């Protein structure tokens, strides 16, 4: 067992707050905001040795990232940004920083009760997206 065990599984989006304004701040255009904001993704998290894999599946896009904690990687996001990402575990929270074009956004995934609470922050705008086990 590892602390990260609490994240493993299939998680379904159950609520979202302020995601449209967060996407505006990230620079996402109108049409992608509307279609992406409509999505109800599942977030599938698994661990094999030191490698964590996080899949996002939805009607909009399916994405997958695999990574080792603290080791930067290149990622293409669902909205087609080309970003440099680093994910760490900080006090029980998975902290995902994405850098591109001199910008940065931070995505925090935390277990709270039976939920996975995900806070996304860009330029002082936060969106909170909550997932429950499938
Ligand atoms: C379908 C719809 C939305 C996304 C998405 C997107 C973004 N940020 C998230 C953040 C990350 C973690 C929780 O939300 C998700 C997401 N990934 N999984 N669920 N949502 C960046 C803003 C532009 C839109 C793409 C992915 C697929």
Short mmCIF file of C-alpha atoms and ligand atoms in Angstrom, two decimals:
data_model
loop_
_atom_site.label_atom_id
_atom_site.label_comp_id
_atom_site.label_asym_id
_atom_site.label_seq_id
_atom_site.Cartn_x
_atom_site.Cartn_y
_atom_site.Cartn_z
CA UNK A 1 0.00 0.00 0.00
CA UNK A 2 0.82 3.62 -0.67
CA UNK A 3 -0.91 6.78 0.44
CA UNK A 4 -1.82 7.28 -3.47
CA UNK A 5 -4.06 4.17 -3.15
CA UNK A 6 -6.96 6.43 -2.12
CA UNK A 7 -6.98 7.96 -5.60
CA UNK A 8 -7.11 4.74 -7.57
CA UNK A 9 -10.35 3.91 -9.37
CA UNK A 10 -12.91 5.23 -11.79
CA UNK A 11 -14.36 8.57 -10.86
CA UNK A 12 -17.38 10.26 -12.55
CA UNK A 13 -17.95 14.03 -12.64
CA UNK A 14 -20.88 15.00 -10.38
CA UNK A 15 -20.51 18.79 -10.04
CA UNK A 16 -18.64 21.67 -11.55
CA UNK A 17 -18.33 25.29 -10.47
CA UNK A 18 -16.86 28.20 -12.41
CA UNK A 19 -15.31 26.05 -15.13
CA UNK A 20 -16.37 28.39 -17.94
CA UNK A 21 -14.55 31.39 -16.41
CA UNK A 22 -11.54 29.21 -15.58
CA UNK A 23 -11.40 28.15 -19.26
CA UNK A 24 -11.64 31.80 -20.35
CA UNK A 25 -8.63 32.58 -18.22
CA UNK A 26 -6.71 29.64 -19.67
CA UNK A 27 -7.44 31.05 -23.15
CA UNK A 28 -9.85 28.44 -24.41
CA UNK A 29 -12.07 29.63 -27.26
CA UNK A 30 -15.82 29.78 -27.29
CA UNK A 31 -16.68 26.57 -29.12
CA UNK A 32 -14.30 24.40 -27.09
CA UNK A 33 -15.55 25.99 -23.86
CA UNK A 34 -19.11 25.13 -24.73
CA UNK A 35 -18.44 21.52 -25.77
CA UNK A 36 -15.86 20.81 -23.09
CA UNK A 37 -18.04 22.41 -20.43
CA UNK A 38 -20.86 20.08 -21.44
CA UNK A 39 -18.73 17.00 -20.98
CA UNK A 40 -19.22 14.69 -18.01
CA UNK A 41 -15.76 13.03 -17.86
CA UNK A 42 -14.67 9.99 -16.04
CA UNK A 43 -11.23 10.17 -14.42
CA UNK A 44 -9.54 6.73 -14.20
CA UNK A 45 -6.52 6.61 -11.93
CA UNK A 46 -4.17 3.64 -11.62
CA UNK A 47 -0.72 2.92 -10.30
CA UNK A 48 1.86 0.34 -11.49
CA UNK A 49 5.10 0.58 -9.54
CA UNK A 50 6.24 4.20 -9.60
CA UNK A 51 4.11 5.04 -12.66
CA UNK A 52 0.77 6.75 -12.13
CA UNK A 53 -1.71 6.83 -15.02
CA UNK A 54 -4.63 9.23 -15.19
CA UNK A 55 -7.16 8.79 -18.04
CA UNK A 56 -9.93 11.26 -18.75
CA UNK A 57 -12.74 9.80 -20.92
CA UNK A 58 -15.65 11.76 -22.24
CA UNK A 59 -17.70 12.45 -25.35
CA UNK A 60 -15.43 15.42 -26.08
CA UNK A 61 -11.96 13.91 -25.89
CA UNK A 62 -10.20 10.96 -24.30
CA UNK A 63 -6.80 11.69 -22.88
CA UNK A 64 -4.23 9.75 -20.89
CA UNK A 65 -1.15 10.76 -18.98
CA UNK A 66 1.41 8.52 -17.32
CA UNK A 67 4.12 9.96 -15.06
CA UNK A 68 6.46 9.54 -12.14
CA UNK A 69 6.00 11.93 -9.25
CA UNK A 70 8.43 14.89 -9.49
CA UNK A 71 9.53 14.08 -13.07
CA UNK A 72 8.46 16.59 -15.72
CA UNK A 73 6.73 15.44 -18.87
CA UNK A 74 5.28 16.93 -22.04
CA UNK A 75 1.50 16.79 -22.25
CA UNK A 76 -1.09 17.76 -24.90
CA UNK A 77 -4.27 18.80 -23.09
CA UNK A 78 -7.86 18.06 -24.23
CA UNK A 79 -8.10 21.66 -25.50
CA UNK A 80 -4.88 21.12 -27.54
CA UNK A 81 -2.39 23.04 -25.46
CA UNK A 82 1.20 21.76 -25.58
CA UNK A 83 2.33 22.04 -21.95
CA UNK A 84 5.20 20.99 -19.70
CA UNK A 85 3.77 19.28 -16.63
CA UNK A 86 5.07 18.20 -13.24
CA UNK A 87 2.97 16.30 -10.72
CA UNK A 88 3.96 15.87 -7.05
CA UNK A 89 2.29 14.57 -3.90
CA UNK A 90 2.23 17.28 -1.28
CA UNK A 91 0.64 16.49 2.00
CA UNK A 92 -1.69 13.93 0.48
CA UNK A 93 -2.76 16.16 -2.48
CA UNK A 94 -1.70 15.47 -6.07
CA UNK A 95 -0.44 18.82 -7.35
CA UNK A 96 -0.22 19.12 -11.20
CA UNK A 97 1.42 22.21 -12.62
CA UNK A 98 1.20 22.92 -16.39
CA UNK A 99 3.42 25.53 -18.03
CA UNK A 100 3.10 26.92 -21.56
CA UNK A 101 3.66 30.19 -23.34
CA UNK A 102 4.82 31.88 -20.13
CA UNK A 103 1.54 30.89 -18.39
CA UNK A 104 0.85 28.38 -15.62
CA UNK A 105 -2.18 26.57 -14.23
CA UNK A 106 -2.31 24.32 -11.16
CA UNK A 107 -4.66 21.37 -10.79
CA UNK A 108 -5.00 19.87 -7.30
CA UNK A 109 -6.70 16.47 -6.79
CA UNK A 110 -7.70 15.71 -3.18
CA UNK A 111 -9.71 12.87 -1.54
CA UNK A 112 -12.41 14.34 0.69
CA UNK A 113 -14.96 11.91 2.13
CA UNK A 114 -16.08 9.70 -0.73
CA UNK A 115 -15.25 12.31 -3.32
CA UNK A 116 -12.32 13.35 -5.45
CA UNK A 117 -12.26 17.13 -5.34
CA UNK A 118 -10.33 18.83 -8.10
CA UNK A 119 -9.38 22.49 -7.90
CA UNK A 120 -8.06 24.18 -11.02
CA UNK A 121 -6.51 27.62 -10.69
CA UNK A 122 -5.39 30.08 -13.40
CA UNK A 123 -4.62 33.84 -12.84
CA UNK A 124 -6.73 33.96 -9.61
CA UNK A 125 -9.75 32.13 -11.06
CA UNK A 126 -10.63 28.77 -9.53
CA UNK A 127 -12.88 26.05 -10.74
CA UNK A 128 -13.92 23.18 -8.47
CA UNK A 129 -14.92 19.90 -10.04
CA UNK A 130 -16.13 17.04 -7.87
CA UNK A 131 -16.11 13.33 -8.82
CA UNK A 132 -17.62 10.26 -7.19
CA UNK A 133 -16.83 6.57 -7.67
CA UNK A 134 -18.42 5.04 -10.72
C1 LIG B 1 -13.53 16.77 -21.31
C2 LIG B 1 -13.90 18.00 -20.80
C3 LIG B 1 -13.02 18.78 -20.04
C4 LIG B 1 -11.70 18.36 -19.87
C5 LIG B 1 -10.78 19.21 -19.08
C6 LIG B 1 -10.17 20.34 -19.65
C7 LIG B 1 -9.41 21.16 -18.84
N1 LIG B 1 -9.27 20.95 -17.50
C8 LIG B 1 -9.86 19.83 -16.93
C9 LIG B 1 -9.62 19.74 -15.47
C10 LIG B 1 -8.55 18.86 -15.09
C11 LIG B 1 -8.92 18.07 -14.01
C12 LIG B 1 -10.34 18.40 -13.71
O1 LIG B 1 -10.83 19.26 -14.72
C13 LIG B 1 -10.56 18.92 -17.71
C14 LIG B 1 -11.11 17.66 -17.15
N2 LIG B 1 -10.39 16.55 -17.15
N3 LIG B 1 -11.20 15.63 -16.61
N4 LIG B 1 -12.38 16.18 -16.24
N5 LIG B 1 -12.30 17.44 -16.61
C15 LIG B 1 -8.73 22.40 -19.36
C16 LIG B 1 -9.68 23.49 -19.81
C17 LIG B 1 -10.28 23.26 -21.19
C18 LIG B 1 -11.09 21.98 -21.32
C19 LIG B 1 -10.34 20.72 -21.08
C20 LIG B 1 -11.33 17.15 -20.39
C21 LIG B 1 -12.24 16.38 -21.14
#
